[PDB]
Amino acid sequence: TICADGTSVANGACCKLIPVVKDLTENLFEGECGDAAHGALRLVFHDAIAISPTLGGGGADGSIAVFNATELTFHANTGIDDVLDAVGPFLLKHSDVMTPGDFIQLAGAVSLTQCNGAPRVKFVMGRPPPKAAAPNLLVPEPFDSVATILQRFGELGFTKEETVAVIGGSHSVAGADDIVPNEQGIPFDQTPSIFDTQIFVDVQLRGTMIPGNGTTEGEVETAVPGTVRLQSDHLLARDASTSCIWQSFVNQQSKMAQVFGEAIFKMSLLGQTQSKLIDCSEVIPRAIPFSHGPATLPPGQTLKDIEQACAASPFPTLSTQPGPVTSVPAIPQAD
Ligand code: HEM
Ligand SMILES: [Ca+2]
Numbered sequence: 001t002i003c004a005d006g007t008s009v010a011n012g013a014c015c016k017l018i019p020v021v022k023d024l025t026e027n028l029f030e031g032e033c034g035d036a037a038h039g040a041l042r043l044v045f046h047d048a049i050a051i052s053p054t055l056g057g058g059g060a061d062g063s064i065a066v067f068n069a070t071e072l073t074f075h076a077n078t079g080i081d082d083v084l085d086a087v088g089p090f091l092l093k094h095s096d097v098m099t100p101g102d103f104i105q106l107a108g109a110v111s112l113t114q115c116n117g118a119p120r121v122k123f124v125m126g127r128p129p130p131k132a133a134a135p136n137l138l139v140p141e142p143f144d145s146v147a148t149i150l151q152r153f154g155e156l157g158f159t160k161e162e163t164v165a166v167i168g169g170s171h172s173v174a175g176a177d178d179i180v181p182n183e184q185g186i187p188f189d190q191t192p193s194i195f196d197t198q199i200f201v202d203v204q205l206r207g208t209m210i211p212g213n214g215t216t217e218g219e220v221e222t223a224v225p226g227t228v229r230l231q232s233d234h235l236l237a238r239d240a241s242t243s244c245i246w247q248s249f250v251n252q253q254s255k256m257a258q259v260f261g262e263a264i265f266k267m268s269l270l271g272q273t274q275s276k277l278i279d280c281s282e283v284i285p286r287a288i289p290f291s292h293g294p295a296t297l298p299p300g301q302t303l304k305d306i307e308q309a310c311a312a313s314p315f316p317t318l319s320t321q322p323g324p325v326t327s328v329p330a331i332p333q334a335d
């Protein structure tokens with residue numbers, strides 16, 4: 001079926017989403033991989049991961065928005081209020097054509113297409129409205145152990161490979177708003193606007209500093225000024241279960257994107273039954289091709305600054321980015 005804009009879709013029920021996609025790219029993200037995009041991507045996780053085989057939750061159901069009055073009381077959802085201040089108006093204005101679970105997954109898929117190198121993901125629709133808030137304690141925290149993280153993702157059907165890719169890849173295009181005291185938009189990698197493998201490098205370096213004037217639980221030292229490091233990421237890069245996977249993505253941008261894309265789609269299905277869903281992948285914008293060069297060490301760092309953790313292979317012999325040590329700019333906030 002050809003929609004009013006000229007897009008061909010397999011299922012004409014998808015055409016009603018074309019204006020949503022246009023509104024998101026023009027008016028929420030404004031064609032940029034900035035804070036609005038980061039918030040939409042984070043919201044995918046906080047909505048979808050909040051499901052457990054034994055404790056409940058509906059998964060990718062829109063509960064984080066519909067039942068925000070409850071879910072925003074949960075410590076792990078700190079800062080989701082500010083994300084919803086930017087994204088929530090769009091969810092409401094498009095609530096005539098799609099459920100909130102569908103909206104959140106669409107917005108995350110469209111957000112990725114605003115970022116250099118990020119994959120175009122598959123997108124399906126048909127998720128029913130949510131029944132209840134998620135239980136608390138289903139969203140992983142940055143102070144959770146690797147065993148805890150792997151049990152949560154593993155019990156939901158993710159491989160360790162997918163787990164590392166989706167966490168680390170997301171953190172390629174992301175900052176911390178509620179970790180560094182009184183500071184917002186502190187990136188996890190040197191390039192929060194670029195879906196590259198700098199995150200994997202940046203985290204493997206020996207940490208030497210903390211930004212700002214104190215710490216939050218689940219923060220550790222970082223190696224690059226103007227960035228922050230989560231304990232979870234730190235540990236994922238170093239634990240024997242995951243460290244070789246972490247290392248495997250360094251300077252493997254295409255492989256990391258492919259795995260990331262598949263993991264996001266899997267995440268988008270949590271709590272759902274794939275049988276009742278309709279593919280609307282044609283409505284997703286085209287991706288921006290990765291247009292940067294190889295991964296590099298940050299200025300001033302050398303391979304002796306890498307903390308080797310993978311026993312099977314040495315860390316890749318990357319060149320060092322030329323120039324003086326510089327601080328990474330903070331991300332201007334949408335809210
Ligand atoms: C073990 C898993 C994870 C932990 C513990 C974790 C932790 C965090 C923390 C603590 C922040 C900062 C929040 C704040 O200061 O308000 C953050 C930011 C973010 N996370 Fe993760 N995260 C994980 C997985 C993921 C996944 C799977 C995705 C996406 C599907 C994701 C996407 C993001 C994005 C995009 C941001 C940046 C938001 C912004 O710039 O405003 N996270 N994460
Ligand atoms: Ca949910």
Ligand SMILES: [Ca+2]
Pocket residue numbers: 171172173189190191192193194195196197198199
């Ligand atoms: Ca990056």
Ligand SMILES: [Mn+2]
Pocket residue numbers: 035038039175177185333334
């Ligand atoms: Mn933010």
